[PDB]
């Protein structure tokens, strides 16, 4: 099936703006994350928030 | 969250739409509300009633 719901590219300012709107449309599913460790920390903190 | 738009109809009581002269910028257009009429039910008619 591979129902890839959406592709999100956080350019910058993960907590400032323009990224919360994209991250808020992700529903219960598997989230393939590609970034660096020091940046995956921020992305996962925002995702928990 | 993408919950406001053409396809979503937010219906609210008179509690949030009070003082219709003050409209926050965060209220979507088409925000259906119910309230006591202050347009056609004039104060003179109110006192007479």
Swiss-Prot record, chain A:
Compartment(s) of residence: Cell projection, Dendritic spine; Cell membrane; Synapse; Postsynaptic cell membrane
Reported tissue expression: Detected in brain cortex, olfactory bulb, hippocampus including the dentate gyrus, striatum, thalamus, superior colliculus, inferior colliculus, midbrain and cerebellum (at protein level). Detected in brain cortex, hypothalamus and cerebellum.
Highest taxon listed in the record's lineage: Eukaryota
Family: Belongs to the glutamate-gated ion channel (TC 1.A.10.1) family. NR2A/GRIN2A subfamily.
Domain statement: Contains an N-terminal domain, a ligand-binding domain and a transmembrane domain. Agonist binding to the extracellular ligand-binding domains triggers channel gating.
Subunit structure: Heterotetramer. Forms heterotetrameric channels composed of two GluN1/zeta subunits (GRIN1), and two identical GluN2/epsilon subunits (GRIN2A, GRIN2B, GRIN2C or GRIN2D) or GluN3 subunits (GRIN3A or GRIN3B) (in vitro). Can also form heterotetrameric channels that contain at least two GluN1 subunits and at least two different GluN2 subunits (or a combination of one GluN2 and one GluN3 subunits) (in vitro). In vivo, the subunit composition may depend on the expression levels of the different subunits. Found in a complex with GRIN1, GRIN3A and PPP2CB. Found in a complex with GRIN1 and GRIN3B.
Chain's role: Component of N-methyl-D-aspartate (NMDA) receptors (NMDARs) that function as heterotetrameric, ligand-gated cation channels with high calcium permeability and voltage-dependent block by Mg(2+). NMDARs participate in synaptic plasticity for learning and memory formation by contributing to the slow phase of excitatory postsynaptic current, long-term synaptic potentiation, and learning.
Name this protein carries in UniProt: Glutamate receptor ionotropic, NMDA 2A
Originating organism: Rattus norvegicus (Rat)
From Swiss-Prot, chain B:
Positions contributing to Zn(2+) binding: 21, 37
Tissue spec: Detected in brain cortex, olfactory bulb, hippocampus including the dentate gyrus, striatum, thalamus, superior colliculus, inferior colliculus, midbrain and cerebellum (at protein level). Detected in brain cortex, hypothalamus and cerebellum.
Location in or out of the cell: Cell projection, Dendritic spine; Cell membrane; Synapse; Postsynaptic cell membrane
Description of how the protein assembles with itself and partners: Heterotetramer. Forms heterotetrameric channels composed of two GluN1/zeta subunits (GRIN1), and two identical GluN2/epsilon subunits (GRIN2A, GRIN2B, GRIN2C or GRIN2D) or GluN3 subunits (GRIN3A or GRIN3B) (in vitro). Can also form heterotetrameric channels that contain at least two GluN1 subunits and at least two different GluN2 subunits (or a combination of one GluN2 and one GluN3 subunits) (in vitro). In vivo, the subunit composition may depend on the expression levels of the different subunits. Found in a complex with GRIN1, GRIN3A and PPP2CB. Found in a complex with GRIN1 and GRIN3B.
Function as written in the Swiss-Prot or TrEMBL entry: Component of N-methyl-D-aspartate (NMDA) receptors (NMDARs) that function as heterotetrameric, ligand-gated cation channels with high calcium permeability and voltage-dependent block by Mg(2+). NMDARs participate in synaptic plasticity for learning and memory formation by contributing to the slow phase of excitatory postsynaptic current, long-term synaptic potentiation, and learning.
Family: Belongs to the glutamate-gated ion channel (TC 1.A.10.1) family. NR2A/GRIN2A subfamily.
Domain remark from Swiss-Prot or TrEMBL: Contains an N-terminal domain, a ligand-binding domain and a transmembrane domain. Agonist binding to the extracellular ligand-binding domains triggers channel gating.
Name of this chain's protein: Glutamate receptor ionotropic, NMDA 2A
Organism lineage string: Eukaryota, Metazoa, Chordata, Craniata, Vertebrata
